[PDB]
Coordinates of C-alpha atoms (C1' of nucleotides) and ligand atoms in Angstrom, one line a residue:
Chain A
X1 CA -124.0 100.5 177.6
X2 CA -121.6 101.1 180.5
X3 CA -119.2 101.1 177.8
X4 CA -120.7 102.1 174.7
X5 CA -118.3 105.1 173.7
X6 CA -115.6 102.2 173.5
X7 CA -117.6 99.9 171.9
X8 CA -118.6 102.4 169.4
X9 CA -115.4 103.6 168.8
X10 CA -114.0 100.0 168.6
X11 CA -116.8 99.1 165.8
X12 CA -116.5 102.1 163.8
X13 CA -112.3 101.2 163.5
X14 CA -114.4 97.6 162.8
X15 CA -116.4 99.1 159.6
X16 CA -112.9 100.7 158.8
X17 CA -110.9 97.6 157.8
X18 CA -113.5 95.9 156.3
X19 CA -114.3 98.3 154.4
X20 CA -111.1 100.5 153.2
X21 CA -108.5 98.0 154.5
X22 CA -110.2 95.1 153.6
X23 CA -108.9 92.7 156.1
X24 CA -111.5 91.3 157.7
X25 CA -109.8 89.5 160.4
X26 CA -109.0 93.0 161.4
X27 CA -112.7 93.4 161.8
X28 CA -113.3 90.4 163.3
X29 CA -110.7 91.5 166.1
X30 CA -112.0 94.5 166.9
X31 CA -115.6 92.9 166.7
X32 CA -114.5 90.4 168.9
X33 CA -113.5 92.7 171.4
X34 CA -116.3 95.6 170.8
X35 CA -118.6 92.6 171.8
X36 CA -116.4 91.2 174.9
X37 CA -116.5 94.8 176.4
X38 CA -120.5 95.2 175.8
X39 CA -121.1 92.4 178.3
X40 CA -118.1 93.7 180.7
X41 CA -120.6 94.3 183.8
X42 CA -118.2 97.3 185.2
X43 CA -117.6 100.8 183.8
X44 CA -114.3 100.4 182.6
X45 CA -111.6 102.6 183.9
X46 CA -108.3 101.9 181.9
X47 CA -106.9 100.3 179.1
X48 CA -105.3 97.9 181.2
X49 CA -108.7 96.9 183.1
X50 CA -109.7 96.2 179.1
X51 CA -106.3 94.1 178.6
X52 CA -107.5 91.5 181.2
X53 CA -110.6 90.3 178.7
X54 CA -110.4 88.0 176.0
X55 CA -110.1 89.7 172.6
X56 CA -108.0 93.0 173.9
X57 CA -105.0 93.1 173.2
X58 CA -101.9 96.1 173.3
X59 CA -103.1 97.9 170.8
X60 CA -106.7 98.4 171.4
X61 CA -105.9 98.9 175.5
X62 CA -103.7 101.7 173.6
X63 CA -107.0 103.1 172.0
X64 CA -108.9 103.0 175.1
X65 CA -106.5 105.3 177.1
X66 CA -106.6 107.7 174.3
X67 CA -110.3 107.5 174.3
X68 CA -110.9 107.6 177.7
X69 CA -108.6 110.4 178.0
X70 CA -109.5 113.0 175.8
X71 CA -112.8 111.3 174.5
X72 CA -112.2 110.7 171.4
X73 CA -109.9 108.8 169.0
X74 CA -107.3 111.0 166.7
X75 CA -106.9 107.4 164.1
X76 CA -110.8 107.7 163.7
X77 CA -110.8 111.6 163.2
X78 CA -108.2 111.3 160.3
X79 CA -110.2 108.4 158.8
X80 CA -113.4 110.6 159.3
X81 CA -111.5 113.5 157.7
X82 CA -110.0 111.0 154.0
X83 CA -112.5 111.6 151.4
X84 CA -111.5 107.9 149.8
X85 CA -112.8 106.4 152.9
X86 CA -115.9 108.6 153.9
X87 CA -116.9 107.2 150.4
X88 CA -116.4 103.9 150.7
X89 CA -117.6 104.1 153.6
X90 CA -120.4 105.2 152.7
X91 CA -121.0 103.1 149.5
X92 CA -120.8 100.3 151.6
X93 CA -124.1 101.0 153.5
X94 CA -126.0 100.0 150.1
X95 CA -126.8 96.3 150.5
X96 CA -125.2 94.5 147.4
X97 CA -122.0 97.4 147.6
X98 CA -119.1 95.7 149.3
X99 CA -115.5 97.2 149.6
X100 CA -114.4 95.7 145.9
X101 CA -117.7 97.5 143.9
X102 CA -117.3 100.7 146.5
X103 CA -113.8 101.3 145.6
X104 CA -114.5 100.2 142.2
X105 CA -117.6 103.3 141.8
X106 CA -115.5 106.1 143.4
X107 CA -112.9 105.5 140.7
X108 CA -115.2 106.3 138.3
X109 CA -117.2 109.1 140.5
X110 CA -120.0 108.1 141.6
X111 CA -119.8 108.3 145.2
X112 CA -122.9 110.0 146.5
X113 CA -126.4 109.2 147.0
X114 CA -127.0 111.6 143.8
X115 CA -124.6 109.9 142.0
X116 CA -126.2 106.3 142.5
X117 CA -129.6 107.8 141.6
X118 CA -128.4 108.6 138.2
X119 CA -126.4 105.3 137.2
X120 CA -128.6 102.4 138.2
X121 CA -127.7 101.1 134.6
X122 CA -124.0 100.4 136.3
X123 CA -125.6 98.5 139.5
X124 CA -126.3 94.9 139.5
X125 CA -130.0 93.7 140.4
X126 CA -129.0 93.2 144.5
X127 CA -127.5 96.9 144.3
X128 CA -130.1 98.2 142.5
X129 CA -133.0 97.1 145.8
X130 CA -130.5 98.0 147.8
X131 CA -130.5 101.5 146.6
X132 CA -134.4 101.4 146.1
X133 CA -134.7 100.8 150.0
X134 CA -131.7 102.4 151.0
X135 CA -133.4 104.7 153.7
X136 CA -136.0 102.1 154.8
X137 CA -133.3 99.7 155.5
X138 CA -131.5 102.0 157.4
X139 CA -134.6 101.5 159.9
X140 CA -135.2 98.8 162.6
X141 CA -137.8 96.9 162.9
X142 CA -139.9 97.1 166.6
X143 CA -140.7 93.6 168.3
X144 CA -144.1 94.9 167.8
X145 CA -144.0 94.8 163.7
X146 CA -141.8 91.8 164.2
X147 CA -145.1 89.9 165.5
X148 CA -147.4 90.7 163.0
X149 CA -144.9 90.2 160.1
X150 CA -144.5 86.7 162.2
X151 CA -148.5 85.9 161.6
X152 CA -148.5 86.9 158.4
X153 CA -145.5 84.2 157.4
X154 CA -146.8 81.4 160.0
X155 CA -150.3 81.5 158.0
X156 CA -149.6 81.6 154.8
X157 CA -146.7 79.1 154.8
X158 CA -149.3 77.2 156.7
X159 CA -152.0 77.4 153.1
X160 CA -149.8 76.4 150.8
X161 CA -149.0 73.2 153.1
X162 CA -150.7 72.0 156.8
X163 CA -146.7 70.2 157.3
X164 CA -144.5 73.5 156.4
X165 CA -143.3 74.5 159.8
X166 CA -141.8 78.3 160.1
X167 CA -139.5 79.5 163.0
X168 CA -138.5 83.6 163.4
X169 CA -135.2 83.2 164.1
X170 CA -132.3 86.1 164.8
X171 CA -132.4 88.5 167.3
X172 CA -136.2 88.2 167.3
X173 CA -135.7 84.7 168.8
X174 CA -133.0 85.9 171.1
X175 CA -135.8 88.3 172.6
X176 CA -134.7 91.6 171.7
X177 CA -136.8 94.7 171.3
X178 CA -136.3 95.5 167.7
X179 CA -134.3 93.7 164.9
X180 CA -132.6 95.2 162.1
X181 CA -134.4 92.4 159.9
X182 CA -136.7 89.4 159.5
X183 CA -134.8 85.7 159.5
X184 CA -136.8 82.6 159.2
X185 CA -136.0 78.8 159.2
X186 CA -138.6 76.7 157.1
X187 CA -138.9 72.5 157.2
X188 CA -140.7 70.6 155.8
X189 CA -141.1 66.7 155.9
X190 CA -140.1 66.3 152.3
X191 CA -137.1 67.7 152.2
X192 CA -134.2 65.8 154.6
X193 CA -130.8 65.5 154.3
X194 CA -131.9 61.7 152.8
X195 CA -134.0 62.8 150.1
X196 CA -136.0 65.7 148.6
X197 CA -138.8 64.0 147.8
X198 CA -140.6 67.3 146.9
X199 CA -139.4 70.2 144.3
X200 CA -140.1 74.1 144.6
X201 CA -140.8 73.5 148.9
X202 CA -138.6 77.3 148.8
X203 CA -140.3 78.7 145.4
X204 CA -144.0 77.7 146.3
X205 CA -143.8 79.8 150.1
X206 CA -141.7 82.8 148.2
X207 CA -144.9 82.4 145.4
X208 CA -147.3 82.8 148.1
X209 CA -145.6 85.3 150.4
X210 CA -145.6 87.2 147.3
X211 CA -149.3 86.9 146.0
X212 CA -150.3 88.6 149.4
X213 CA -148.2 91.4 148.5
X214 CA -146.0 90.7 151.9
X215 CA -143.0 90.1 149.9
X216 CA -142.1 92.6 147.2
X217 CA -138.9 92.3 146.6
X218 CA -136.1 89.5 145.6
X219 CA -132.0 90.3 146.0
X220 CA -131.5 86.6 146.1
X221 CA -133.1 83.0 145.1
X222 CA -132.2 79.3 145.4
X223 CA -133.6 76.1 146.4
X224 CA -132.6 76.6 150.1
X225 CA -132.1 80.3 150.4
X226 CA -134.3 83.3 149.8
X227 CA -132.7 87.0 150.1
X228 CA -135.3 89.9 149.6
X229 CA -137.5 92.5 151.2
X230 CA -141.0 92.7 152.6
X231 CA -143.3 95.1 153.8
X232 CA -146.5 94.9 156.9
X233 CA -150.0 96.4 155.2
X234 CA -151.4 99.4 156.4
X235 CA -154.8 100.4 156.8
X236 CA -156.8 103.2 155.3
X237 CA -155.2 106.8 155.5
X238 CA -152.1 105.2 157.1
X239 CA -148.2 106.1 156.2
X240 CA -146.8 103.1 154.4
X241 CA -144.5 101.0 156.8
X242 CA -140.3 101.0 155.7
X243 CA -139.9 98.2 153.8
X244 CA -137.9 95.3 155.0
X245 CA -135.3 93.1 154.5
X246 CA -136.5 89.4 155.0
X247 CA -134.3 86.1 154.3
X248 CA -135.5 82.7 154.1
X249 CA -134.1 79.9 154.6
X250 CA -134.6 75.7 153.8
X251 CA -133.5 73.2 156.2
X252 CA -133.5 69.3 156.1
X253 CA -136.0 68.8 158.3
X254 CA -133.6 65.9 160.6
X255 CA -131.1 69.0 161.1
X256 CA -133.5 71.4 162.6
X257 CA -131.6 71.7 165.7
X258 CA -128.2 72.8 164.2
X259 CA -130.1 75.3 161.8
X260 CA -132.0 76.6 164.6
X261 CA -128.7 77.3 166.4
X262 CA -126.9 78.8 163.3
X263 CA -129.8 81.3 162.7
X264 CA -130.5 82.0 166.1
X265 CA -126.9 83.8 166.4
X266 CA -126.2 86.5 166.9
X267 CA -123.1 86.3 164.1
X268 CA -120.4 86.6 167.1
X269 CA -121.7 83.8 169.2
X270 CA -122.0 81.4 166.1
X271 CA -118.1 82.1 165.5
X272 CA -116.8 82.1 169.3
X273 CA -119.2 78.7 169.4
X274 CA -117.5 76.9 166.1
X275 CA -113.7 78.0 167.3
X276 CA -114.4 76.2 170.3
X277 CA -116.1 73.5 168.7
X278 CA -112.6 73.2 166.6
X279 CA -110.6 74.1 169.8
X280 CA -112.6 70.6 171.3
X281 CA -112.2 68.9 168.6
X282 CA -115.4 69.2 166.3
X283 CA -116.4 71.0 163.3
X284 CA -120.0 72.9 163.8
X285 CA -122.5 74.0 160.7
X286 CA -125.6 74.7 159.9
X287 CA -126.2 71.0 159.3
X288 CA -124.7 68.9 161.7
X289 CA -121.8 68.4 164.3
X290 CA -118.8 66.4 163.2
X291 CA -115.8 65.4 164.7
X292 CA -112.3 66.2 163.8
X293 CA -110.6 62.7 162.9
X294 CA -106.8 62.4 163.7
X295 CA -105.5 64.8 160.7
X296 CA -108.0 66.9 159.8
X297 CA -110.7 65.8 157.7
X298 CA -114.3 65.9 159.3
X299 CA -115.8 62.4 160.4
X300 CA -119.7 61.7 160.0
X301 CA -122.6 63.6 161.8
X302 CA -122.9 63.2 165.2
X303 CA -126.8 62.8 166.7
X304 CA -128.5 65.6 167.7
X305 CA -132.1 65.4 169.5
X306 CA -131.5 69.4 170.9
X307 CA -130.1 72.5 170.5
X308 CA -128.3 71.8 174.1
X309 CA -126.3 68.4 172.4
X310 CA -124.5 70.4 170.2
X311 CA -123.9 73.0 173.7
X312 CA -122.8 69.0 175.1
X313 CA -120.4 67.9 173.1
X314 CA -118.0 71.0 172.7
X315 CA -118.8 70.9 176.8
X316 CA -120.7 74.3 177.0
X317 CA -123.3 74.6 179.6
X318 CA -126.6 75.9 177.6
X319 CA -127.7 79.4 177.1
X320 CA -130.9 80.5 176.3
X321 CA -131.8 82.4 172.7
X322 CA -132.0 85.6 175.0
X323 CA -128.1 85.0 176.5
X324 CA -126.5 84.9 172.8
X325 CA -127.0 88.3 172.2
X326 CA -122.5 89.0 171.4
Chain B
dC1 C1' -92.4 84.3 167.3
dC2 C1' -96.1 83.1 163.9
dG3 C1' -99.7 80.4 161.9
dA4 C1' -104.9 80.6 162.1
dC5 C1' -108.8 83.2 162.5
dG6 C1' -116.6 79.7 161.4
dA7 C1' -118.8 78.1 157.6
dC8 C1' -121.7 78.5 153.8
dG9 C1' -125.7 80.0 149.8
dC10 C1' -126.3 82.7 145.8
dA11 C1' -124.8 85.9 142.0
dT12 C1' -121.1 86.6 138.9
dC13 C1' -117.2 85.9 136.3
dA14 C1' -113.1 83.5 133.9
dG15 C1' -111.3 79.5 131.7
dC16 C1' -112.0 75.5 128.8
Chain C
dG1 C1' -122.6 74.3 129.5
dC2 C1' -119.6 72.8 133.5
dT3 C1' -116.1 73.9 137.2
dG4 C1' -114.1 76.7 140.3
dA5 C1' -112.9 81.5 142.2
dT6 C1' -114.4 85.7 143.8
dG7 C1' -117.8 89.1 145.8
dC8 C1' -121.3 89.8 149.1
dG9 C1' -124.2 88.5 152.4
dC10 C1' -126.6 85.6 156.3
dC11 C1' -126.3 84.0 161.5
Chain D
dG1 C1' -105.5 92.7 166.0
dT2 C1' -105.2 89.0 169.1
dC3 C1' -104.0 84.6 170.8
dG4 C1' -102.4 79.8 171.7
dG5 C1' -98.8 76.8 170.5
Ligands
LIG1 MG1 -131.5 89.3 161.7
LIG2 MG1 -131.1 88.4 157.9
LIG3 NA1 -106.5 90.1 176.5
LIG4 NA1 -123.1 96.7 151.6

DNA sequence: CCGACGACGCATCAGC
DNA sequence: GCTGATGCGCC
DNA sequence: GTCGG
């Protein structure tokens, strides 16, 4: 946090390209760099001193000797001052609202909170939650609700079958003191990347998860992947808890170790792992490890017994779930 | 200089 | 209905 | 926007 004016200023101009611009490799740039300076152990002094880490170039150094400067950032204070992108901008907040439907909605007006409330007709079913939670989502979730929201899942995956095995992955996994949201991996033994010798093993947990009023809502469902929300009970006299957003998700049970990783993040890491993994010559999903063959195409999974043999054979040394956190 | 930038599931749509 | 492209989202 | 070829 040594640097968190820069990093603030340098996600913000993040948000701005992916949202207005729409060029999301500009926002992968400056979130590469935004996440390169959060870890940068020093207060930084210059623009230059930022040069010298992978990820800053000339033109954010640039940025950072405005910002250091005069403390702020006259590019951001236009953009905060366009009404097109303060719109946008703010359109994009609603889950389901991406930069196409946000610059699609202020064309037609609605561009306000208001003006959402009044034209749910116009909103697909994802935008529509989204909207519904907006403010709750907006929330993050303590390590604290994290644990009992972690019970909750754990026992009643466990009732519908003894062999269902759930793991809280994200930055809950990675330690942290809040997350913005729930993620979990489930396996079970029926369901490898042989055979699914099993239908429903997703629909019958979402069924159950949803009986016990934990999950309430559904912005997504397939038979590997559940997007939707979910909300902790409360006792007697007690202020409902936010509701959350939760997302579920069914792995082969052989290729737990490279779903593990995937979901275990954060985001950043995942993508400066799998451009190494290409950099040394292998191709990294949630699935498996393959190698590159001579021209391009992917050979066949590589064996993996660990999440550290997938750190082995792009030749990282491991790093704990807590020392992912980019 | 300039090509490449991680990889994928689900909802949604256009074309046949 | 199927196939593929696009939008949005997940880490 | 940045970097490696
Ligand atoms: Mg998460
Ligand atoms: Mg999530
Ligand atoms: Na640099
Ligand atoms: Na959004």
């Amino acid at each position: 946090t040594l640097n968190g004016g820069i990093t603030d200023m340098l996600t913000e101009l993040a948000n701005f390209e992916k949202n207005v611009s729409q060029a999301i490799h500009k926002y992968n740039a400056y979130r590469k760099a935004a996440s390169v300076i959060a870890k940068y152990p020093h207060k930084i002094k210059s623009g230059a001193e930022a040069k010298k880490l992978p990820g800053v170039g000339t033109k954010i150094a640039e940025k950072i000797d405005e910002f250091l400067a005069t403390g702020k950032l006259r590019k951001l204070e236009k953009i905060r001052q366009d009404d097109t992108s303060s719109s946008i901008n703010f359109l994009t907040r609603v889950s389901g609202i991406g930069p196409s439907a946000a610059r699609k909605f202020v064309d037609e007006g609605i561009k306000t909170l208001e003006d959402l409330r009044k034209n749910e007709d116009k909103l697909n079913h994802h935008q529509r939650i989204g909207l519904k939670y907006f403010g709750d989502f907006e929330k993050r979730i303590p390590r604290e609700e994290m644990l009992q929201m972690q019970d909750i899942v754990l026992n009643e995956v466990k009732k519908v079958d003894s062999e269902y095995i759930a793991t809280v992955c994200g930055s809950f996994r990675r330690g942290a003191e809040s997350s913005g949201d729930m993620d979990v991996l489930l396996t079970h033994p029926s369901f490898t990347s042989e055979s699914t010798k099993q239908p429903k093993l997703l629909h019958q947990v979402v069924e159950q998860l949803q009986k016990v009023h934990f999950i309430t809502d559904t912005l997504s469902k397939g038979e590997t992947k559940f997007m939707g929300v979910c909300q902790l009970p409360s006792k007697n006299d007690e202020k409902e808890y936010p509701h959350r957003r939760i997302d579920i998700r069914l792995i082969p049970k052989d290729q737990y170790y490279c779903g593990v990783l995937y979901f275990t993040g954060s985001d950043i890491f995942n993508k400066n792992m799998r451009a190494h993994a290409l950099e040394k010559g292998f191709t990294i999903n949630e699935y498996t490890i393959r190698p590159l063959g001579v021209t391009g195409v992917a050979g066949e999974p590589l064996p993996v017994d660990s999440e550290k043999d997938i750190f082995d054979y792009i030749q990282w040394k491991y790093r704990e779930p807590k020392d992912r956190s980019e």
